[PDB]
Design a protein around this ligand. Structure first.
Ligand SMILES: [Mg+2]
Ligand SMILES: [Mg+2]
Ligand SMILES: [Mg+2]
Ligand SMILES: [Mg+2]
Ligand SMILES: [Mg+2]
Lengths: 77, 74
């Protein structure tokens, strides 16, 4: 899985983009947060990720969802 | 996801989220999927669980279930 250090680091990055502190970020920020952590998903990969995480159409990504996407992205690096 | 599918998924999720906190546990994912007429293998379930439960809390909420169903359909 992910370590407790990886989770802490991902949470710090995530926190930088949740500027209202409500626990979510917009899907429009996913690429930016991933790039801040050194990942460089293509626009196609990013759009696929967004369609999936945003299946409910609320346009929100929360921290467990971000970890899931990082975890999925790290199985494919 | 069609509106029908989303509706079917929400009905299924609700079958298990009887306390209404919008959350079920990872232990229940297999049974939820069976309620939809699917018979995922233990290996498939472990794969889904390891991903959605990256944070180690053992919890699945409804948006996550939808995402998992969407990802399983690809
Ligand atoms: Mg926010
Ligand atoms: Mg959301
Ligand atoms: Mg519940
Ligand atoms: Mg959870
Ligand atoms: Mg959530």
């Amino acid at each position: 899985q992910l370590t407790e250090e990886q989770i802490a680091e991902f949470k710090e990055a995530f926190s930088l983009f949740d500027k209202d502190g409500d626990g979510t970020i917009t899907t429009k920020e996913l690429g930016t947060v991933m790039r801040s952590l050194g990942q460089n998903p293509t626009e196609a990969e990013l759009q696929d990720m967004i369609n999936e995480v945003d299946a409910d159409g609320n346009g929100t990504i929360d921290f467990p969802e971000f970890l899931t996407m990082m975890a999925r992205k790290m199985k494919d690096t």
